[PDB]
Design a protein around this ligand. Structure first.
Ligand SMILES: [Mg+2]
Ligand SMILES: [Mg+2]
Ligand SMILES: [Mg+2]
Ligand SMILES: [Zn+2]
Lengths: 196, 52, 161, 190, 134
RNA sequence: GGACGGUGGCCAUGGAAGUCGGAAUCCGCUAAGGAGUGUGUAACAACUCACCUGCCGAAUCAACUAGCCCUGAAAAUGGAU
């Protein structure tokens, strides 16, 4: 089972690199399974994105560089959480398409927020059923019209720090778009040339 | 009425622990065997009961 | 002071959110210590005071008297600070030199009460005797002969009924 | 089984130098001097470089129990280096439900007076180990800072405070009051 | 904001239910429909399907219209009053058809797989209608 | 770091959405994702596992077994290799 899967992965990567002479090395950041599925369905007819074990990728391409040279140039660059994007079209189309299909990731418990989000002094819009959470986070409010209205601005969280568990749910209930991050291309490999 | 951060800091020392079933010794949460001779370093451990 | 402010703020917010009878049916219904609609004290020890009483005794130390008492009362609570070195109020949280000044409420109300409490519980007979003439309080019989926690009760009773 | 040789090397920065007197290690850095003797462990201590200052710990013909001491000695020496370069700072938050815990720092941060732990009239006087200074942080509300050079002494002083503030005859799952070591770090954060 | 945000979906059905159904629980989400809104919702969603009726409601600021996506279990239980492959072949020409798929045979694979609730032998050796849908 | 769609999979219902339960036990995307290991919720949600991936670069893990030692192992006058 395991050895069969590894051999099948070797076969898949070698046939894909043979089919597409030009490919990108792409950084798989903290993108969810749904985000990988949506980029897969976005390039369902454009190109192919292939991930897996870097230790396997290095070994297979080093063992089967013989049928096509200039494959060794990708070796010192496939490090960390990286994968391949074998393509037939140009660079710009795939580049700006995978930069275009961004997905906003909501902050959760034990999360890092590179972006700053600030609560406004605007009506929440729902019933007064989050007063306990508002008082826990410290935002003292007023009650009117069967809803909740924020009476002041509060610096909710800073940039690149730790977000609290009783603060992530407050951001979720207020429905503010937090820091977002998608899929970024490490570099581009065109038949023997490497570019940004 | 303690804020949750300080509450969990106190609970790290007071509640998040293992108890030996033979000698009731208070062991660290990742314990597998009791550290005391009088039970024979038994691995009969349970979590410390919560107030829930 | 922070605990007192939290209590009065909580009472004000609950009376606002359930008392939709704002200005109108009953007029203003909020409570402010400046307005004199909150009191401070302890019932077990039989003593209580108001910003009105403290303002009045400071004015006495210092129809028109009512206005003066109201002015001192307004300046005696809130984010007003007092410089003990200069004996003057200030809106600034710190002195112009850079020394932080205690606020008027604490400095001019709690500090004497805290001083007498500390003196009585630490058994400073000479200071407890001289604060009597400092406060100019009348002192009847049966209390000069005993000291301690009942002495604290008696002196607070006869100072702030 | 007797392993022929078990060795481990630690690296010494430039700003700190280490002298050996048999098995007594003297670690001299910017923040002072530390000194600790390992005569209870039969090891060979060597200094190697005149450029990078490697200290190597060797154990010959050891068994399972005394191969465990090589890494222990290396960790102690690394902690000494860390103490004389960056120092050890333990931050202790004091938690309470009802009664605030009043902590008064006596002479030069050597005595700690806990006054109102759970509202009892007894006063706790904790004596810090020599070379350890205690203070009340100016940043947070209820926080003690214990600064020193020896991790042994600093952590032992923190444990003295923590065990001094101990609830008795009560459900300690409910009564969480006390002073607890919040975090352990360095000074100057280099 | 188009005067209403009622795009949240709904998964009650079968009998009217009313109190037993989560309609009074979801009523405050809009606060416009209330009992009349979530009763006309059941009026429009009694059938198609006769099941839990996974739908999406749209508010005309007094009235409510329910668009019912074709859930696979819903449509198979509704089409039931055996192979029956010819009906499930066309049962997904109107679905979302995203399914994190690559070709059309994935959908019929998923249908034959989910209809086990045996229709599993036909899962492996299937060659008819591979590209029939597109 | 990820841990996805049908699917809040069928029937139990007053809610049991992967986790009170009676049965079944799939596929697509896949590097990986159990129509579910536990925590948890009224149910959700949120944690967490089992599965993969990155850093790390060399051996490691499990179940048994039998030697010595320890626990099991409590008595009365002070005491017996
Ligand atoms: Mg270590
Ligand atoms: Mg008791
Ligand atoms: Mg024995
Ligand atoms: Zn034990």
């Amino acid at each position: 089972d395991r050895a069969t899967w590894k051999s099948n992965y070797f076969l898949k990567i070698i046939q894909l690199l043979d089919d597409y002479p030009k490919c990108f090395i792409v950084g798989a950041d903290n993108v969810g399974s749904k985000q990988m599925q949506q980029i897969r369905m976005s390039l369902r007819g454009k190109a192919v994105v292939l991930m897996g074990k870097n230790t396997m990728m290095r070994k297979a391409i080093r063992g089967h560089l013989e049928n096509n040279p200039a494959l060794e140039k990708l070796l010192p660059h496939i490090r960390g959480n990286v994968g391949f994007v074998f393509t037939k079209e140009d660079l710009t189309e795939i580049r700006d398409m995978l930069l275009a299909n961004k997905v906003p990731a909501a902050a959760r418990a034990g999360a890092i927020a590179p972006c700053e989000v600030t609560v406004p002094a605007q009506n929440t819009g729902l019933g007064p059923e989050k007063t306990s959470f508002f008082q826990a986070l410290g935002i003292t409010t007023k009650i009117s019209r069967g809803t909740i209205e924020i009476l002041s601005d509060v610096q909710l969280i800073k940039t690149g720090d730790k977000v609290g568990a009783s603060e992530a749910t407050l951001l979720n209930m207020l429905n503010i778009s937090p820091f977002s991050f998608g899929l970024v291309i490490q570099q581009v490999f065109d038949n023997g040339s490497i570019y940004n | 009425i303690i804020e949750p951060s300080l509450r969990q800091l106190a609970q790290k020392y007071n509640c998040d622990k293992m108890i030996c079933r033979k000698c009731y010794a208070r062991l660290h949460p990742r314990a597998v065997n009791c550290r005391k001779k009088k039970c024979g370093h038994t691995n009969n451990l349970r979590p410390k009961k919560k107030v829930k | 002071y922070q605990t007192f402010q939290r209590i009065v703020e909580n009472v004000n917010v609950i009376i606002s959110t359930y008392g939709e009878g704002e200005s109108g049916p009953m007029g203003n219904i909020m409570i402010d210590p400046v307005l004199g609609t909150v009191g401070f004290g302890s019932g077990l020890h039989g003593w209580a005071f108001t910003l009105k009483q403290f303002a009045e005794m400071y004015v006495a130390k210092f129809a028109e008297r009512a206005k003066k008492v109201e002015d001192m009362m307004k300046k005696l609570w809130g984010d007003r600070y007092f410089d003990p070195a200069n004996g003057k109020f200030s809106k600034s949280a710190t002195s112009p030199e850079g020394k932080k000044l205690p606020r008027t409420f604490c400095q001019l109300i709690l500090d004497p009460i805290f001083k007498v409490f500390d003196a009585i519980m630490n058994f400073k007979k000479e200071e407890t005797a001289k604060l009597i003439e400092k406060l100019d309080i009348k002192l009847d019989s049966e209390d000069k002969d005993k000291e301690g926690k009942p002495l604290l009760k008696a002196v607070m009773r006869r100072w702030l009924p | 089984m007797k392993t022929i040789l078990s060795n481990q090397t630690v690296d010494i920065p430039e700003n700190v130098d280490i002298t050996l007197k048999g098995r007594t290690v003297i670690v001299k850095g910017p923040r002072g001097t530390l000194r600790r003797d390992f005569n209870h462990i039969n090891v060979e201590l060597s200094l190697l470089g005149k450029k990078k200052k490697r200290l190597r710990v060797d154990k010959w013909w050891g068994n399972r129990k005394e191969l465990a001491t090589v890494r222990t000695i290396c960790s102690h020496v690394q902690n000494m280096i860390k103490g004389v370069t960056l120092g050890f700072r333990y931050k202790m938050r004091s938690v309470y439900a009802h009664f605030p815990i009043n902590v008064v720092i006596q002479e030069n941060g050597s005595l700690v007076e806990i006054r109102n732990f759970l509202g009892e009239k007894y006063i706790r006087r904790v004596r810090m180990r020599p070379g350890v200074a205690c203070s009340v942080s100016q940043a947070q509300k209820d926080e003690l800072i214990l600064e020193g050079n020896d991790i042994e002494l600093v952590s032992n002083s923190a444990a003295l405070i923590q065990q001094a503030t101990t609830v008795k005859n009560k459900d300690i799952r409910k009564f969480l009051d006390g002073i607890y070591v919040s975090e352990k770090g360095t000074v100057q954060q280099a | 904001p188009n005067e209403i945000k009622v795009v949240y979906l709904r998964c009650t059905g079968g009998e009217v239910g009313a109190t037993s159904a989560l309609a009074p629980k979801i009523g405050p989400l809009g606060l416009s429909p209330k009992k009349v809104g979530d009763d006309i919702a059941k009026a429009t969603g009694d059938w198609k399907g006769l099941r839990i009726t996974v739908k999406l409601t749209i508010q005309n600021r007094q009235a409510q219209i329910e668009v019912v996506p074709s859930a696979s279990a819903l449509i198979i239980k509704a089409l039931k009053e055996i192979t029956f492959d010819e009906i499930v072949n066309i049962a997904r020409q109107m679905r979302h058809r995203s399914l994190a798929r690559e070709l059309s045979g994935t959908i019929k694979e998923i249908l034959g797989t989910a209809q086990s609730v045996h229709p599993h032998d036909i899962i492996d050796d299937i060659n008819s209608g591979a590209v029939e849908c597109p």
